[PDB]
Amino acid sequence: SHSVKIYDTCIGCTQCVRACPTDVLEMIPWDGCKAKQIASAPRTEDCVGCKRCESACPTDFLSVRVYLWHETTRSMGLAY
């Protein structure tokens, strides 16, 4: 559904996923920062698009980035 992307300007603060209410994100090891971790987005099918991840990305503009795309029943957040 939605296309979440994490760019290399990350600082590995783990606020994107700790804010993400649908388990879309997960921190993985990395070698590009002092924290040695970066966020990944495997479960984009569960992505609703609420952008709580990028409302908590403390960078110049953003590192995590949500692109609104094909909306399915779970990206639209429907219990019916």
Partner: protein, 69 residues
Amino acid sequence: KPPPIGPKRGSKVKILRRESYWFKNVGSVVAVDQDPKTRYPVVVRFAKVNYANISTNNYALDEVEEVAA
């Protein structure tokens, strides 16, 4: 090199990054990650915050340029 690679701690620096909030704005280098594998070591501290209420950001060496002052 083990000696510093980037600007000095406190050197007021300009941002050449086009996507940053402080583009063509001065800054204040507070640290430079001397590890020769990180991509954006230059930790800058600006005076005015961005839209996310943040005054600091990491920048590269080529995405930065010190002023004549």
